[PDB]
Each structure stands twice: as C-alpha cells, then as structure tokens.
Amino acid sequence: PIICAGPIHSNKSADIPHLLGYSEKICQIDRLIHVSSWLRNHSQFQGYVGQRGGRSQVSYYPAENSYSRWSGLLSPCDADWLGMLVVKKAKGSDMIVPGPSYKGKVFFERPTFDGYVGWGCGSGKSRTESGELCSSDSGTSSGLLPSDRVLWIGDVACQPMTPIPEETFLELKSFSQSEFPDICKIDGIVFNQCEGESLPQPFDVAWMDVGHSHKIIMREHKTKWVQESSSKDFVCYKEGTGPCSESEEKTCKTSGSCRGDMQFCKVAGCEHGEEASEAKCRCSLVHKPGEVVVSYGGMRVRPKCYGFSRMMATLEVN
Ligand SMILES: *[C@@H]1O[C@H](CO)[C@@H](O[C@@H]2O[C@H](CO)[C@@H](O[C@H]3O[C@H](CO)[C@@H](O)[C@H](O)[C@@H]3O)[C@H](O)[C@H]2NC(C)=O)[C@H](O)[C@H]1NC(C)=O
C-alpha cells in the first residue's frame, strides 16, 4: 500500500470523487477506487471493488508476480487513473486470454497489443470460470467487494515515458517483426503479412509501450531500473489523515517546507525542528526499483509500460 490502508466502504451508493492531487490519485489507486470507477461507468456496476484489501490484495495472472511486490510500480489501471493510458471497455472483438481464474472476478484487465482492455461486470454479477460471461453471484450483491475479485493479468510496470521519434518506433516495430516472424496478428492487430493463418493462440511475451500506436514485443532485451527521485517518485500523506491535497503536495514538492524521509528532503527540501502543535504534511519515496529503461534493437528506450503479459497471437501456415 503506497499511502492508504485497505478501504472499508459502508455504502455502495458513495460517489467516487475525482481528485487532482498526485497522492490523492495514488490513494484511490491504493483503494482500487479506480477499478470501482472503471466498473461504474462501463458495467453499470454498483459500489466498489477492493474492500478491506485494496490494491495490494488484487489478484494477478500469474500469481507469482514481480512488480506486485513493488507497491509504486504502476499497473495499467493505475496508469489509466493517472491518465497515462486508457484501459478501454471490453468490446466483443477483444480476446479473453485463457489461463487465469476468472470465475468470481468482477474486473479483469489485460494489455492488448494496441492498448489495454478491461472486462467488468454489472452489480450482483461475476465472471464465469471462462471469463466470457458475467453470471449472477450472491457473493457480489453487497456491492462492496474484495480485491481478489479484481484480476490484473501480466507482470506490468507502467511509468512516465521518454517519448521517442516515430522513426525510432518504426525501427523497433520492424526489429520485433524480425524477432517474431512467426506471428501474423496480435489482439486483432496486424503484426506481419501471411495471408495463410491459424486461429488465435495464447502468447506469453515481454513487451513495452513506447507511446505509439502499438507495443513492441521483445524476445531478447535488457532492462535497467534507474532511480530518478522525480516528484512522481514521492507521495505526500498527512499522518493519520490520508493523502495531502493537490496544493499541499505541490507545496511540499516545490517549496521544500513539508517534512519527509531521507531521499525526499535531499531532493525537494524540508525543515525539521519547527512544529508547535498539530502535525504537518509529509512525503515519502514511493517504493519501486525505479524507472525501467529497456535495451532493445540497439536502442535504449524508457517506455510508458513494460510488462510480460499473455496476449492472443495468430500464427502462420506453411
Ligand atoms: C468514470 O466516469 C467519470 C465521469 O466521466 C470519469 O471521471 C472524470 O474523469 C475525467 C478524466 O480524468 C475528468 O475530466 C476532466 O477533469 C478536470 C476538470 O474537472 C480537468 O482538469 C481534466 O483535464 C479533465 O479534462 C472528470 O473531471 C472526471 N469527472 C468526475 C465526475 O469524476 C472517470 O474517469 C470514469 N472512469 C474511468 C475509469 O475512466
């Protein structure tokens, strides 16, 4: 949990405010408030996901998940809440991967080749074991549901990118195709030219989102987590209260008057020994290995999202 403990909602009726503060959105991300809001607008779902458990107790496919152990490594959905990308509503043509335990799940999200698709359920519903249907569920009637009903597939890390010229991305695009000549179409998105294809098959591939019209999938590739101590590397909470507001957090990150930990004070400035009563804002280093930088096709890329997920990939016929 980056900031806020597992949410304990009393109501399904409660509205989900949109908060401007970085920490505020991190807090909602912590309490899976963003999935709950994804569910409300798209599945006409009633209430919340992540009850008592929050984002840490979300279920991943696979369960043995690296980046999960790092609370500030952003999933596609957190990234969506942070506006970095958008997890699009499930359309009929987006393919549900086999593998995960979808039954019970009210929400599961998957990186497609072209983006990120969510499959949500209506109130009092939950996915069957296949994931292709929301069947009725008495366990979901309360509308305030546990985190293991949310499923994030893929070991995904999302992060502020360094944009790359399109010529660079086209180099990477074709480098992948020379690495993956076998594949013809991924998530309904044409990868190569084949004419003779086989029907969609699963595909465990590492990949990165470079901010372009699709991801680049990588067989061989090097990564190097580097620490940046940028302001997004810190969240700002009020002790006992929750996250600082939009202005309070900006003040801590610009002026250098709020309290913090070892690295936050080194970087943004803080003061110690003041007080008089009533405790202050504080900021702390988000826990993550850093910003991933990926060596691939001779290019050092700092991507929007890096992950190893399962997509569906059609193959050729010889
Ligand atoms: C579910 O529906 C919500 C309503 O559309 C939506 O929340 C809305 O999110 C957008 C995008 O973040 C916000 O848009 C604008 O907000 C401020 C001004 O208020 C601007 O500064 C921004 O630049 C942006 O243009 C809406 O304010 C916000 N509305 C409400 C009532 O919360 C959610 O995003 C939807 N759910 C998901 C998962 O996307």
**Residue spans per domain, the chain:** 1-153, 154-227+287-318, 228-286
Cβ–ligand 1 contact at 116 (below 6 Å): no
By alpha-carbon position, which residue is closest to atom 12 of ligand 1? Answer: 83
Residues 6+ apart with CB under 8 A from 244: 21, 23, 236, 237, 238, 252, 258, 281, 283
Among 18, 78, 85, the mutation site with the greatest number of ligand 1 atoms within 8 A of its Cβ is 18
Breaks, C-N > 2.5 A, in the chain lie after none
In Å, what resolution does this model reach?
2.6
Distance 224 CA to ligand 1 centre (A): 34
**Residues in the chain, overall count:** 318
Compute CA distances 251 → 113, 243, 304, 305, whole Å.
Answer: 39, 13, 27, 29
What are the DSSP calls for 27-60, one per residue?
Answer: HHHHTTHHHHHHHHHHH---SEEEETTTGGG-EE
Cβ–ligand 1 contact at 36 (below 6 Å): no
Distance 19 CA to ligand 1 centre (A): 9
Compute CA distances 42 → 6, 7, 14, 198, 232, whole Å.
Answer: 24, 22, 17, 32, 29
By alpha-carbon position, which residue is closest to atom 22 of ligand 1? Answer: 20
By alpha-carbon position, which residue is closest to atom 15 of ligand 1? Answer: 18
